[PDB]
């Protein structure tokens, strides 16, 4: 009783391999699954309020260095000093600034103006940008309440409101200056339940936060996550301090990798992105902007100073990032260098990039730096750069670099196949994937590196245009409704599908108190009606009564159009006619089509009954009930 | 030729279980390994050092 095994062993142990190969796949997917980007938002100096604005600004090689702000309460005359070495002075007067830093909408978030006054500007900017980023992703923020999504933010203290505080404004000073409240306020107003951590790691904070978020998504702690950074200056102390170090260029413009680089220039901004696991993003039907593959972070270590960099650490972090991403040094095509513009950092960074990337290259790679266009955004720098690269993948065009005449002579440019980017280039799809790299090295010593890849190709689906479609727009205030209507009218002036925008507006958007709807059949009529819209109502619901009238509301050919376009009404009319068929000698459907006589009252009264019943049925269909 | 196939199949596909069970243990230890403490230091009020 031991010979009946030959077939059973094979049948049993085929399942062994088939089943336990899945575990081997799962270990790889848990160690190195790619992350998907499903939404971005940002604002930067130069009037930028959306990623499209940033792409437009970059594509036409326009800088945005401006004058000092005068509305923040600074003392311009005493601070500004062309003399380099006068006590308590700065020898620069340029830079990038957000002239709308103080603007905020307190009523939208249910915050009294007295609270808003004591609130730090970074909290307000983070709130607004987070809401904008969530709206961009096409996910309803209201329905997002109660889930387990997480937030990660990068910011540093600035000493806002460090002077005397009046008792009237006293009450929310402590809660409006702290750092944990930056994520606490978002998790409070949105009702989230995932981890909320704020990380301060000098100028490389934001990417580090992103890195942390990725790890959480791999651990299963959270399903949704959003990461970003923010920086706005409240006091000019940094300007004076770095002026005493003679590290700021007199012009205030950062000439990255140029032969005439002599300093840097500070700036401000804020950026936020939303991250997802690739499989979950495919399952939920979102759209993929780009894919983050791998990342790494380490420390400068023992160097020639507390602030001096080290090339070996940068080389090591680049190799670690490439190994984690599972790629090769010859696969990337463009790297967004740090490009701070110092007389020391640029040669070291160029030498490191030559050492690691500029080897065995069949085709030379390119590099650029957004800092030449905007400046040093500090904690909000890296995220901004990331956004730029994403746009470069979507528009299939290499952006140019500004403020370059000759490459710096402190390095040997012949050591590798790497060359600067001074003119726009075409970056089309060619079968092989397109990849990019992002770098950021902080003052404290930490360094980061990120690898981005184009979104997977997808096929489009053709749809037929509907004859007549509604357009519903909702907001929280009347002025916001007017702004929404104006923006929609501006959008519809282009070449877009009315059905597409109507479906997106009805499905990918929230619902609020103030409401306004229009009906359209063509784009021109739609925009005309939207511009002419002046009526809206914030009514309060009560109880609904369905009044059924008497007689005198008849005309031959009532439902011939409705039977021809409304399926539920047509089916109800047909079913009612079939029910009434045995005890009648006509066809009610043909009677209402235009083949009936009003004289036959035995057809008249049932006609009114049937049209009333069908009108009730179609009302039920839309989702309202008596 | 192929008559002694039972022994071949058994010894071929025993290795699959033997090693892929180790793979399963590897994923379990990757997602749930304990972390040990080897050193501490503290300074608290009351003369504690």
């Amino acid at each position, epitope marked *: *009783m*031991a010979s*009946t*095994d030959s*077939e*059973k*062993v094979a*049948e*049993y142990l085929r*399942r*062994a391999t088939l*089943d*336990l190969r*899945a*575990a081997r796949q799962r270990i790889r997917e848990l160690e190195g699954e790619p992350i998907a980007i499903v939404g971005m938002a940002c604002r930067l100096p130069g009037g930028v309020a959306s990623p499209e604005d940033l792409w437009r600004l970059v594509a036409e090689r326009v800088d945005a260095v401006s004058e000092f702000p005068g509305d923040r309460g600074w003392d311009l005359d005493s601070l500004i000093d062309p003399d380099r070495e006068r006590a308590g002075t700065s020898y620069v007067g340029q830079g990038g600034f957000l002239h709308d830093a103080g603007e905020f909408d307190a009523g939208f978030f249910g915050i009294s103006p007295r609270e808003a006054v004591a609130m730090d500007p970074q909290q307000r900017l983070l709130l607004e940008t987070s809401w904008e980023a969530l709206e961009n992703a096409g996910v309803d923020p209201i329905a997002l309440k109660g889930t387990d999504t997480g937030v990660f933010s990068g910011l540093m203290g600035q000493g806002y409101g460090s002077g005397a505080v009046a008792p009237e404004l006293e009450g929310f000073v402590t809660t409006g200056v702290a750092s944990s409240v930056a994520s606490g306020r978002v998790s409070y107003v949105l009702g989230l339940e995932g981890p909320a951590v704020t990380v301060d790691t000098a100028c490389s904070s934001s990417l580090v936060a992103m890195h942390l978020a990725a790890q959480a998504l791999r651990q299963g702690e959270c399903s949704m996550a959003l990461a970003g950074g923010v920086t706005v200056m409240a006091t000019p102390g940094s300007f004076v301090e770095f002026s005493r170090q003679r590290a700021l260029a007199p012009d205030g413009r950062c000439k990255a990798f140029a032969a005439a680089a002599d300093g840097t220039g500070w700036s401000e901004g804020v950026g936020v992105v939303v991250l997802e696991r690739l499989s979950v993003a495919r399952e939920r039907g979102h759209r993929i902007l780009a894919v983050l593959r791998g990342s790494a972070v380490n420390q400068d270590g023992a160097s020639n100073g507390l602030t001096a960099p080290n090339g070996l650490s940068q080389q090591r972090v680049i190799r670690r990032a490439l190994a984690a991403a599972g790629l090769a040094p010859s696969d990337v095509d463009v790297v967004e260098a740090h490009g701070t513009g110092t007389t020391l950092g640029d040669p070291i960074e160029a030498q490191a990039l030559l050492a690691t990337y500029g080897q065995e290259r069949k085709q030379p790679l390119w590099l650029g730096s957004l800092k030449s266009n905007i400046g040093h955004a500090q904690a909000a720098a890296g995220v901004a750069g990331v956004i730029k690269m994403v746009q470069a993948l979507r528009h299939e065009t290499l952006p140019p670099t500004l403020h370059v005449d000759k490459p710096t002579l402190e390095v040997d440019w012949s050591a590798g196949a790497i060359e600067l980017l001074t003119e726009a280039r075409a970056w089309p799809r060619n079968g092989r994937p397109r990849r990019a790299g992002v770098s950021s090295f902080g003052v404290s010593g930490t360094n980061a590196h990120l690898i981005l890849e184009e979104a997977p190709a997808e096929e489009p689906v053709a749809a037929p245009e509907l004859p007549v479609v509604p357009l519903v727009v909702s907001a929280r205030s009347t002025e916001s409704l007017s702004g929404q209507a104006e923006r929609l009218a501006s959008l519809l002036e282009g070449d877009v599908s009315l059905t597409e925008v109507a479906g997106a507006l009805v499905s990918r958007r929230a619902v609020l108190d103030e409401r306004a709807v229009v009906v359209a059949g063509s784009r021109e009529e739609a925009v005309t009606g939207l511009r002419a819209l002046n009526t809206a109502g914030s009514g309060t619901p009560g109880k609904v009564v369905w009044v059924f009238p008497g007689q005198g509301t008849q005309w031959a050919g009532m439902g011939r159009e409705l039977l021809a376009e409304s399926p539920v009404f047509a089916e109800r009319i047909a079913e009612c006619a079939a029910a009434l068929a045995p005890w009648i000698d006509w066809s009610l459907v043909d009677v209402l089509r235009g083949e009936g006589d009003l004289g036959r009252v035995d057809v008249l009264q049932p006609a009114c009954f049937a049209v009333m019943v069908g009108l009730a049925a179609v009302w039920e269909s839309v989702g309202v009930r008596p | 030729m192929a008559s002694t196939d039972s022994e071949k199949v*058994a010894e071929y596909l025993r290795r699959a*279980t033997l090693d892929l*069970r180790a793979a399963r243990q590897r994923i*379990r230890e990757l997602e749930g390994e304990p972390i040990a403490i080897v050193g501490m230091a503290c300074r608290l009020p009351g003369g504690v050092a």
Partner: antibody
Amino acid sequence: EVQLVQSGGGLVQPGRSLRLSCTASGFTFGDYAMSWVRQAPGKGLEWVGFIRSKAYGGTTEYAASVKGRFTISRDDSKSIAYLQMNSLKTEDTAVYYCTRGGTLFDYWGQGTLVTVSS
Amino acid sequence: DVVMTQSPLSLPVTPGEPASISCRSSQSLLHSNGYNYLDWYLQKPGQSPQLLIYLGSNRASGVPDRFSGSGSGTDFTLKISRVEAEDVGVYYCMQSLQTPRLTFGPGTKVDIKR
């Protein structure tokens, strides 16, 4: 992705015949064996029959209690398993499942209810 | 010479605690090649059956990792580290040394302790 769908149920009168079909997809159907099992209402499970694969002769085996009345056929070209209910009785009213594999019951279908009552 | 296997009829279980089910036999199932021939099947109410464990101490895919099996010779044991609400059903300990298998046996019921 490994999947299989059962069909061919309903209510039948004693005396005549019926057939049950199972369509498989997502894997190489020409290799695995297919078996049929049945569960009576408010009872357990007991094996009904199975059919071997082509590589092992493509033979069949049926339960002793109901032997000599049922036939199981396979269509590797269309990857469909057919069971032929013949001369049903009142005791045959039950829920039938089709399962991949002869000895190791790996994957199971959605089942199909068959009622025989005069 | 037909091997007969028996298990406790019913065992109420409180969620959050480990549970164990034993399965004996009338003859050792160990073979010359060195494999025990035992399988564990789970049948949820109003659902099709499902495979849990084959060859004594091997767990199939899809099954949550909290299940485990052990034993040898004539005695085997299924152990679950923590019981949830979805684990209510029927469990069957079915041999494979002797073929064909006429029936799956009476099995064991699982419910909520009260």
